[PDB]
Amino acid sequence: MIRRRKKVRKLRGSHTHGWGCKKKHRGGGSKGGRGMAGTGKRNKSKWTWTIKYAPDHLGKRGFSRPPEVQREVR
Amino acid sequence: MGSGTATFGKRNSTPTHIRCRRCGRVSYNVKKGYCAACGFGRSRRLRKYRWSKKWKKKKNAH
Amino acid sequence: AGKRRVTENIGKGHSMARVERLKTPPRYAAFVPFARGGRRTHPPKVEKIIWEDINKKEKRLALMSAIAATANYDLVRARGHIIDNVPQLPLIVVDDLQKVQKTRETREIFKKLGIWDDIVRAKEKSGVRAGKGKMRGRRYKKAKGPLIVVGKNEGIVLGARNHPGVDVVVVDNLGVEHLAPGTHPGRLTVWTVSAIERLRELYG
Amino acid sequence: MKISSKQPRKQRKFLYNAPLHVRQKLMSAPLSRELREKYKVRNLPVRVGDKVRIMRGDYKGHEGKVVEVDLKRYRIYVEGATLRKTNGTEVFYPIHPSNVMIIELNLEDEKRKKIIERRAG
RNA sequence: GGGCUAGGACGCUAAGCCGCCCGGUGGAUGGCUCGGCUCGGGGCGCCGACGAAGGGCGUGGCAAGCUGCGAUAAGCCCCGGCGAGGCGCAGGCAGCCGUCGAACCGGGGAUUCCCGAAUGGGACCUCCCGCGGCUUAUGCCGCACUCCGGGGUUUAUCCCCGGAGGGGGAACGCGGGGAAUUGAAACAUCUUAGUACCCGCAGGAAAAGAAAGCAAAAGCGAUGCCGUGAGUAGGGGCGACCGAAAACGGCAGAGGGCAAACUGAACCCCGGGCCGACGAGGUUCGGGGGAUGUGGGGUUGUAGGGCCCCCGUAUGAGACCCUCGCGGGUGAAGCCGAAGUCCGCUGGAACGCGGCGCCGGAGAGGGUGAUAGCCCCGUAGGCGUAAGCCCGCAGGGUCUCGGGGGACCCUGAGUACCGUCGGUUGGAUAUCCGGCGGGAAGCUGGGAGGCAUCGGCUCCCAACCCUAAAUACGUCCCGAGACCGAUAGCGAACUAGUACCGUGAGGGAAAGCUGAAAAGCACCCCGGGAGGGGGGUGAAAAGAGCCUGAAACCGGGCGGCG
RNA sequence: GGUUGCACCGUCCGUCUUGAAACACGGGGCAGGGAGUUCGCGGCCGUGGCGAGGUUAAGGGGGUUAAGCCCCGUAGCCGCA
RNA sequence: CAGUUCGCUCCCGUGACCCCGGGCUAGGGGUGAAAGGCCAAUCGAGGCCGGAGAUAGCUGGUUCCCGCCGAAUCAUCCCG
RNA sequence: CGGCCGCCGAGACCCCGGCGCACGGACCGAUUGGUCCGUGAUCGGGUAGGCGGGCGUGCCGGUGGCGUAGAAGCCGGGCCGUAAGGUCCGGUGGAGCCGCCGGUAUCGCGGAUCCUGCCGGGAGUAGCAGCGUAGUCGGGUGAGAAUCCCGACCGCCGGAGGGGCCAGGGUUCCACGGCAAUGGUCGUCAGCCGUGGGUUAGUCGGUCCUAACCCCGCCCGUAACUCGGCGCGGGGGAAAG
């Protein structure tokens, strides 16, 4: 319905095409590392994250139930 | 070897590669007794590979 | 494609780009979109979208909506049907019509009802299409006209598939496509007494 | 609602590619109306031993004997459907059997004769 | 206007600039599409020492390629099918063949070089050789690598008869060997990943498969596969990531054989005959295999397994296999199949327009001089047969069962399990598999229920074997398209895996369009002229890579400037 | 409308860049080809059905030339503390 | 002329010499009177194919128009 | 330098008319959108970026049109649109093609030392010279002769610019007929093009032997092999021994 090219345009001929400086569009570096990468990083990477409460801390602590011990109730 | 390529090249004169008894391509190296293409002399089998080479001609043929 | 064309890099030191060609000829390669013979950029995949859900509740309401449009005069003239039997929107006829399954017999009856005139419209050609794509198929074909709903005599009438632009159905197979193709409802219908009764029972 | 090739390209392939024998069914031509009713045979595969009238093209109502029927070209040569050739001779004008109607037959062969009479009508 | 002087004049301004027009060049654009691509439905679902796949060389009237064949050489023969022209792509010239029925299509048969797993030995696609059969000789026919099975004999292990193996295959499948770039913004564990790549091997499907299972403890009674569980449990610098199953709903459905107990040659293979429709089956006669055990019984669970009894008690009744007449359907891809080629008009030609008229259990799609329901292939409908397949109808042959009484049958070994090192996995103490060391039990027993051990409780029998079907693929056929359309789509619409490159492994293009008909340029003028110009076609910006015929750019001309 | 004379103003284009007429980088000219795409998952938005529930997936019946749509399956997911 | 050539000059020129044909050794390997030289116009680790569309915070490019609003080039943290 | 007066001199500011935006009011529609009026002095530059409306391309469906009395396409002109782009005429061309509405994408090109294809300037320039610097007159032939042939005359070469051969090439050999192309220029010549033809072996060599060395079976290794070294047994290895 919006033609992406219609916005991209041949239009905007921004050519940057909603990316900014030409240098920016590239590899993993813009992203800050792949994926979830950088959450863990002590070092600057992503710390804070595109999570609202930011990132919650790492060490899932606490233990597991066997599935069997869980009666379901309703 | 490097440059002076004209000065060098009097061999090739001697041949080490032919029309093969098995495949018919240009690789039955008379010296080894091995066909580079087909693998005749070396193997009972035809040379064929994942990359391939042999396969590619065959698909191309299809 | 693009694995049958190997691709090798032609270096620097010669005042051209570092963009790959092929060994021996300097031609078309792979891992290019700028080149002749190169990959297209974002080729069509078999994983491409091909379904759009629409709820069972939603579809039936859509069906209802297209049949209702027929009762209206304004939609009916826009749709292009030209009717000589105006107070009879849509027209219901006695149960005997369904059993007829011969082209000559179903023809005669339409002329007498005044609804043969609509088929005359459907004869006019509306699919010798513009564009090269015609070659592959879907050219030299007719156009749409009345829809006939029956209750019985199988799932189609064996003489009414003949007539131009006429599409046959039963109430146990009726879909939006037949009732209002290209999203243009108000397509005249000719009903069978048992079909109207079974549709009364609207279910889903 | 029909079984069909709705591929025009595939349909072409079948016509060009076809066996020499199957081609006989394409070289058939409609019978002049009286004969067509009488035998009750709509069409029959044309011969050189028959008489024919050329019914479409510049020649219309013109008549002649079929000299050759050539299956690979898909055209036949009729007497009096001619061109004048630039040295000084009158040569046949190839035309398709679809343009043509076979006014009289000729039966001096059993294979042809057996069909026309029996299963065809 | 004449003469004289002076000012300013455009008149013939090279070189050169711009705009248009004409011609040329070039091959864009549109339209054209005997090609692809992906999907779906089926088919194909293997072949080979009875010499394959792959390759080489010949083979045509003229043959350079492609295609096909093989010295009987674009083919030979039979039968059936279509049946009246053909002589592959390939329109030439010439000649030929075919009703004692071609071309063509199907089925079967003949010939099928040399190399090749290439098997007698070696080779640079050739050559040599040891036997034996046979014709007087040349000619010609059969043979000798390596297993198993059986003989022969100086038992030289030396040779003979029988059966096999190897190699290929479009992907898929099963079992082995096994990375790194990368990710973790570094990087070693981790990740990529059991991926890429490599070895062995099988089929048309594989494998798995009738619980030493499962474990909502409740409820189930083979196994694949799909959805889902679930991005869940779980693993992990506990970082990045990694990552099930049980179960459910479905699909398709199928259960069987040994070892042993107890029997112990009752047996199998080979050849010959009789009896029998020369078949199934049964009988007999000569060898070979076989107690280191052929064969009978039996198999999760034990039935007393042995020996007993009591009653139905081989009473009774299938169930399975073979033959042969008949009938039925499928199947040589072949047949049959409705209805305008009417009038007036345009045109080179109507498949157009206008006017009239027609068929339909049937207005799909090509084609034809253009745009055709009614011109031609065809269509809804029904039908055909040799081989081959399936079924019933006449016979022959084979062939089943059920309880309690004592030790219940003994009931699978380097296995189960333990300990030590890996590999791997999600597998956690609680994966799976190997290796190294140790090592059970006699159903009076063993294993399993996600740590160890002991008790209860519930389930189930590993260490022996096989398994249809449902599920993978795209070589091939058909059908399909919100796909592409010749600088695009397959490497490749064609002379393609060609030309060509590279020692080799390997790499690899470009190249589509006459016209109604070839009428493919006669005749006439000119020209050294195979070159080129005028006249000759409905129309030659239709005149020979010939539909259209752009831009860059090049000549000339027009306007303007100069 | 073409072209040209005259008046006036004007140091390409694109990109790099704080600053490009540049003695920064790229381009002979023209034609064609040429770059925000697909799946999964999450967070948003608009719009539509249904309603404390809501939706089917897998599937096979059915219909069709085929197929879509139709009606049937409700496993599971999420919501309802 | 030549992707390593030409002429003059110059070194060796019975030798640890030159040369032909056959044959051997293959990529972290060979070979080296040892220069990181050489192993087929490619060598401080050959070439071919595959992984592979590696990945790069880095250079270049990213194509229709119009209307409306219209920046920051700062801060904290970060093998930054 | 300290005063002063009149003027000149922006797109600013004033002023007429128009246009868009924002907001209010009304109306219109089947959705999006549109129209009419009013208010704005305090609305109108613009890169990154955000949003919003339109345009165009290919194909699909419905709908509704066009075409040999001339489609698309091509070239120049006319008209409309802020514009992206639409539309009409003339020439050319000689079969297909629009509009609307709903969809969809291998959807719009000025750059990428872009990729491919075609083309101009450079140029009628450089090269066609450098090494031991070679031709020339009559005559023959032919459409065309500096470079084809015959004679004469003048030279180079002298272990080679000559003779015989191995490898290697593969018909280049030889005859006849030619010159479009090829030959560092012409060409009647040729190694090109067309068409025919030619390599004959007891006594030459191959073939035999065996070398350095190689392969095969077997034995063995390896997870295994188209892999690997030994030991046996056989077979192969010099067109300059």
From Swiss-Prot, chain A:
Q: Which UniProt keywords apply?
A: Ribonucleoprotein, Ribosomal protein, RNA-binding, rRNA-binding
Keyword match Ribosomal protein:
yes
Entry annotated with the keyword Secreted? no
What is the role of this chain? Binds to the 23S rRNA.
Q: Name one GO biological process term.
A: translation
Q: Which gene encodes it?
A: rpl15
Q: Basic residues composition bias: which ranges?
A: 1-28
The UniProt annotation puts the region (Disordered) at 1-43
The entry lists its GO molecular-function terms as: rRNA binding; structural constituent of ribosome
Highest rank taxon of the organism: Archaea
Which family does the similarity line name?
Belongs to the universal ribosomal protein uL15 family.
In its UniProt entry, what is this protein called?
Large ribosomal subunit protein uL15
Per the UniProt entry, what species is this protein from, by scientific name? Pyrococcus furiosus (strain ATCC 43587 / DSM 3638 / JCM 8422 / Vc1)
Quaternary structure per UniProt?
Part of the 50S ribosomal subunit.
Which GO cellular component does the record give, naming just one? cytosolic large ribosomal subunit
Curated annotation (Swiss-Prot), chain B:
Cofactor binding notes: Binds 1 zinc ion per subunit.
Cellular component per GO?
Answer: cytosolic large ribosomal subunit
Would I find Acyltransferase among this entry's keywords?
A: no
Q: Which residues bind Zn(2+)?
A: 20, 23, 35, 38
Keyword set includes ATP-binding: no
Zinc-finger ranges (C4-type) = 20-38
The GO terms describing molecular function are: rRNA binding; structural constituent of ribosome; zinc ion binding
What UniProt keywords apply to this chain's record, in alphabetical order? Metal-binding, Ribonucleoprotein, Ribosomal protein, RNA-binding, rRNA-binding, Zinc, Zinc-finger
Q: Which Pfam families match?
A: Ribosomal_L37e
Q: Tell me one GO biological process term.
A: translation
**Parts forming coiled coils:** none
The text of the family note is: Belongs to the eukaryotic ribosomal protein eL37 family.
On subunit structure and binding partners, the annotation says:
Part of the 50S ribosomal subunit.
Q: What does this protein do?
A: Binds to the 23S rRNA.
HAMAP family under this entry? Ribosomal_eL37 (MF_00547)
What name has this protein been given in UniProt? Large ribosomal subunit protein eL37
The scientific name of the source species is Pyrococcus furiosus (strain ATCC 43587 / DSM 3638 / JCM 8422 / Vc1)
Its gene is rpl37e
Swiss-Prot record, chain C:
Q: Which UniProt keywords apply?
A: Ribonucleoprotein, Ribosomal protein, RNA-binding, rRNA-binding
One GO biological process this protein is involved in is:
translation
- Would you name any one GO CC term? ribonucleoprotein complex
The family assignment reads: Belongs to the universal ribosomal protein uL4 family.
- State one molecular function term (GO): rRNA binding
Task performed by this protein: One of the primary rRNA binding proteins, this protein initially binds near the 5'-end of the 23S rRNA. It is important during the early stages of 50S assembly. It makes multiple contacts with different domains of the 23S rRNA in the assembled 50S subunit and ribosome. Forms part of the polypeptide exit tunnel.
Report which gene this protein is encoded by: rpl4
What is the designated name of this protein? Answer: Large ribosomal subunit protein uL4
Please specify the portion of the entire protein covered by the chain, as first and last position out of its full length: 52 to 255 of 255
Q: Summarize the subunit comment.
A: Part of the 50S ribosomal subunit.
| Origin: domain of life | Archaea
Curated annotation (Swiss-Prot), chain D:
Is rRNA-binding given among the entry's keywords? yes
PROSITE patterns reported for this sequence: RIBOSOMAL_L24
One example of a Gene Ontology biological process annotation: translation
The record's GO molecular-function terms, alphabetically, read: rRNA binding; structural constituent of ribosome
Which Gene3D superfamilies does its entry note?
2.30.30.30
Q: Which GO terms describe its cellular component?
A: large ribosomal subunit
Alphabetic keyword roster? Ribonucleoprotein, Ribosomal protein, RNA-binding, rRNA-binding
Q: What does this protein do?
A: One of two assembly initiator proteins, it binds directly to the 5'-end of the 23S rRNA, where it nucleates assembly of the 50S subunit. Located at the polypeptide exit tunnel on the outside of the subunit.
**Subunit structure, briefly?**
Part of the 50S ribosomal subunit.
Q: List the HAMAP family hit by this protein, alphabetically.
A: Ribosomal_uL24_A
Family (UniProt):
Belongs to the universal ribosomal protein uL24 family.
Q: What is this protein called?
A: Large ribosomal subunit protein uL24
User: Which species?
Assistant: Pyrococcus furiosus (strain ATCC 43587 / DSM 3638 / JCM 8422 / Vc1)
